[PDB]
C-alpha cells in the first residue's frame, strides 16, 4: 500500500504508511474575510516538507512520555524568512511522523496533532484520543500521516504568539527489544505547512 | 471484527456480530445545546465583576463539558441578585465606563434580575485554552462585566452553544475498589 | 543494629499519579540507587541494597516510608526523595534516569 | 561510578561550554541519560531528564543532547551562579544498579 505523498518539490514515499488521516476537516475555510479586507496573497514557494527531530523512543520509556514539538518551530528556511517577514499568516500543517522498527521489537506510538496545547495532569493521557492522531507500530507501520487544517480564535494570527498546533507523542507500550529488534528507536517527524497565506507586510530592517 | 486498527479509523462493531440486533437510540438528551441551556453558578465578586467562561468550577456539569471542546460559541443568560442599580459593558469598555449607567443597566427588582446578554467578543470564537501569551487567558475572551454595589450570586445559561475540538473529560478519581461506589439516593426505609 | 525509618510527606504530586522513589547520596559525593515503588504499590528495589529495605506507600496519610535493615559507617548518606515521571518504571536501574 | 565523565571542566562567561558522559552500548548505547547539577552548600536538582527533556522552572540555557555514544549536557551560555557540581544518571541493562558519573564541577574563571 505505497502512498507516495508530495507537497510543492519534495516527495516523501513510504511503503509501509497505513494511511492519511484528516483531522477536524478533509479542506480549510474560507480564506478572504473581513481580516485583511482582501490584502492576503496565497505564497506557494513555503509548501515544503522540512524535517525535525524528536525524542529517541528507547526500550525504557515507560507509558505516557509527552514529547510535544510546537509548529511552527523555528525554521530557518523559505518558511523562517517568511514568517520573520510578515505579520500575519495561516496554514494546514500535513504533518507525517516515522519510527524506523525492525518489525521484532514491538511497541506502540500515539501521535496526536492536538491544538492549543496545555498541560496534561497524566489521567487526561488515558483519553488523549479525542485529538487527531495515529498509531506508529513497528508491527505493522512504520509511519503515521496526519494533515490537520488551522484553526484559531482569528483568520490570521502572528506565528511569534500564538502557536495553535503542537504534535505531541506519547508512548503507550515500552520498546520491547527482543533477540533481533532494534536497541534504539529515533522518531523523524516532517510537518509540511499546506494552503499557507500571509498579510501585514512589516517594514524589514 | 478485526479491522486494521493501527490507522486509527473510526471502527464501531455492533451486537449484530452475534445474531443480536441493535435498538433504536434516542440521544435527545446527549446533545450539546440541550446540555449547555442550563444555568450554572460563576464564583461572584463583590466590585465591578467581570462576566465569563472558564471561571465556573471545573467539575460542576456546565464548567466540565466547557472545558471539553477548546473553542465555544454561545449567548448567555445571566441571572444576578445584586443589591443596587446593576450595570454592564461590551466586551472592549473601560474600566471606568461602568458609573456612566446609560451603557445597559437593570435596577432593583425584589429578586433576582435576569438578563440576556448576547456573544460581543471580538474573536471569531472564543478558546477554553491559549497556547502563547497574547495558564491565563487573554483579556479579550471575557463577555462583559456586570458591576453592581455587591453581588450575591451569578449563574450563566449558555444559550444556542456549539463547541468545538473535543478535549479530555477526566472522570473522578478512584482507589483500589471495583467501583466508586457512591451513596446514591434511597428511599426512606 | 539501629535500624531506621525515614518517611517525607508528599506536597502535591499524588503517589498514583507519580510515583516516588529513594536516592541516598553516599558519603563524599558518591551516590547510590535506593529503591523506588510504582503508583500502584509495585516496587522495584536495588539487588545490592535488596532484602535490606521495604518501601511502603500509603495513598491516604499522603507519605512514603522506607526501613533499611541497619547502620554503617557507608549507611550514613544525605537521604532524598524524588518524583519521577512516568509513574511505573518498566525497569528499576531505568527510574534512576527519570 | 561506572560512568566515566570529565572529572574537572572550566568555563567562563558568554561562551558554550558542554559536558561529554563516556558511556558505552550497555547503558547510554539503548539508554537515555540524566544530569542533576548539585551546588556545595545544597542538595540534588535536576536539569535534564529524559536527557533531551527540560523541567520545570530551568533556564532555556541549558540543552541536553544524546546524540552519539555520549551524552552532552550544552550550555549555551555559562553564568557565575551556574556553577556547580553535574551528575550523570542511566539505565544499564547489564547491571540490575544504574551507573552515575563522577561530577563534573565547573569554574567561572
Known amino acids: 500500500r505505497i502512498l507516495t505523498t508530495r507537497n510543492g518539490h519534495t516527495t516523501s514515499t513510504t511503503q509501509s504508511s497505513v494511511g492519511v488521516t484528516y483531522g477536524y476537516s478533509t479542506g480549510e475555510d474560507h480564506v478572504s474575510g473581513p481580516n485583511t479586507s482582501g490584502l492576503e496573497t496565497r505564497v506557494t514557494q513555503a509548501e515544503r516538507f522540512f524535517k525535525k527531530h524528536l525524542f529517541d523512543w528507547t526500550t525504557d520509556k515507560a507509558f505516557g512520555h509527552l514529547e510535544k514539538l510546537e509548529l511552527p518551530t523555528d525554521h530557518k528556511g523559505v518558511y523562517g524568512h517568511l514568517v520573520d517577514s510578515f505579520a500575519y499568516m495561516r496554514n494546514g500543517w500535513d504533518v507525517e511522523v516515522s519510527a524506523v522498527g525492525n518489525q521484532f521489537n514491538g511497541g506502540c506510538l500515539l501521535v496526536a496533532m492536538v491544538p492549543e496545547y496545555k498541560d496534561f495532569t497524566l489521567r487526561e493521557k488515558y483519553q488523549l484520543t479525542l485529538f487527531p492522531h495515529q498509531f506508529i507500530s513497528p508491527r505493522t507501520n512504520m509511519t503515521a500521516h496526519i494533515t490537520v487544517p488551522y484553526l484559531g480564535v482569528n483568520r490570521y494570527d502572528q506565528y511569534k504568539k500564538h502557536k495553535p498546533w503542537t504534535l505531541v507523542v506519547m508512548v503507550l507500550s515500552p520498546l520491547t527489544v527482543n533477540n533481533s529488534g532494534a536497541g534504539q528507536i529515533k522518531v523523524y517527524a516532517n510537518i509540511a505547512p499546506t494552503y499557507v497565506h500571509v498579510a501585514g507586510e512589516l517594514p524589514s530592517k | 471484527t478485526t479491522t486494521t486498527g493501527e490507522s486509527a479509523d473510526p471502527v464501531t462493531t455492533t451486537v449484530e456480530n452475534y445474531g443480536g440486533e441493535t435498538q433504536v437510540q434516542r440521544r435527545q438528551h446527549t446533545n450539546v445545546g440541550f446540555i449547555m441551556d442550563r444555568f450554572v453558578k460563576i464564583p461572584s465578586q463583590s466590585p465591578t465583576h467581570v462576566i465569563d467562561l472558564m471561571q465556573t468550577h471545573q467539575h460542576g456539569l456546565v464548567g466540565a463539558l466547557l472545558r471539553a471542546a477548546t473553542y465555544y460559541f454561545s449567548d448567555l443568560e445571566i441571572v444576578v441578585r445584586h443589591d443596587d442599580n446593576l450595570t454592564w459593558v461590551p466586551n472592549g469598555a473601560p474600566e471606568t465606563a461602568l458609573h456612566n449607567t446609560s451603557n445597559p443597566t437593570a435596577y432593583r427588582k425584589g429578586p433576582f434580575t435576569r438578563l440576556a446578554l448576547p456573544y460581543t467578543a471580538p474573536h471569531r470564537v472564543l478558546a477554553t485554552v491559549y497556547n502563547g501569551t497574547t495558564a491565563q487567558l487573554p483579556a479579550s475572551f471575557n463577555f462583559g462585566a456586570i458591576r453592581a454595589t455587591v453581588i450575591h450570586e451569578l449563574l450563566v445559561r449558555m444559550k444556542r452553544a456549539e463547541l468545538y475540538c473535543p478535549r479530555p473529560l477526566l472522570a473522578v478519581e478512584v482507589t483500589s475498589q471495583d467501583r466508586h461506589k457512591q451513596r446514591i439516593i434511597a428511599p426512606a426505609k | 543494629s539501629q535500624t531506621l525509618s525515614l518517611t517525607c510527606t508528599v506536597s502535591?504530586?499524588?503517589?498514583?499519579?507519580?510515583?516516588v522513589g529513594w536516592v541516598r547520596q553516599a558519603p563524599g559525593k558518591a551516590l547510590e540507587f535506593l529503591g523506588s515503588?510504582?503508583?500502584?504499590?509495585?516496587?522495584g528495589y536495588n539487588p545490592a541494597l535488596k532484602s535490606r529495605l521495604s518501601i511502603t506507600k500509603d495513598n491516604s496519610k499522603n507519605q512514603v516510608s522506607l526501613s533499611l535493615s541497619s547502620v554503617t559507617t557507608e549507611d550514613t548518606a544525605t537521604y532524598y526523595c524524588?518524583?519521577?515521571?512516568?509513574?511505573?518504571?518498566?525497569?528499576?536501574?531505568?527510574?534512576?534516569?527519570? | 561510578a561506572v560512568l566515566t565523565q570529565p572529572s574537572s571542566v572550566s568555563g567562563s562567561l558568554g561562551q558554550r561550554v558542554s559536558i561529554t558522559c563516556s558511556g558505552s552500548?550497555?547503558?547510554?548505547?539503548?539508554?537515555?541519560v540524566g544530569w542533576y547539577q548539585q551546588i556545595p552548600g545544597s542538595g540534588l536538582r535536576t536539569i535534564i531528564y529524559?536527557?533531551?527533556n527540560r523541567p520545570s522552572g530551568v533556564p532555556d540555557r541549558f540543552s541536553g543532547s544524546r546524540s552519539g555514544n555520549t551524552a552532552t549536557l550544552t550550555i549555551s551560555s555559562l553564568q557565575a551562579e551556574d556553577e556547580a557540581d553535574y551528575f550523570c544518571?542511566?539505565?544499564?541493562?547489564?547491571?540490575?544498579?544504574?551507573?552515575f558519573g563522577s561530577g563534573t564541577t565547573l569554574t567561572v574563571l
Open positions: 524524588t518524583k519521577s515521571i512516568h509513574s511505573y518504571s518498566v525497569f528499576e536501574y531505568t527510574y534512576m534516569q527519570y
Open positions: 515503588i510504582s503508583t500502584g504499590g509495585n516496587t
Open positions: 529524559a536527557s533531551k
Open positions: 544518571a542511566t539505565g544499564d541493562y547489564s547491571s540490575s544498579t544504574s551507573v
Open positions: 552500548s550497555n547503558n547510554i548505547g539503548r539508554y537515555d
Open positions: 502535591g504530586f499524588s503517589l498514583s499519579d507519580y510515583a
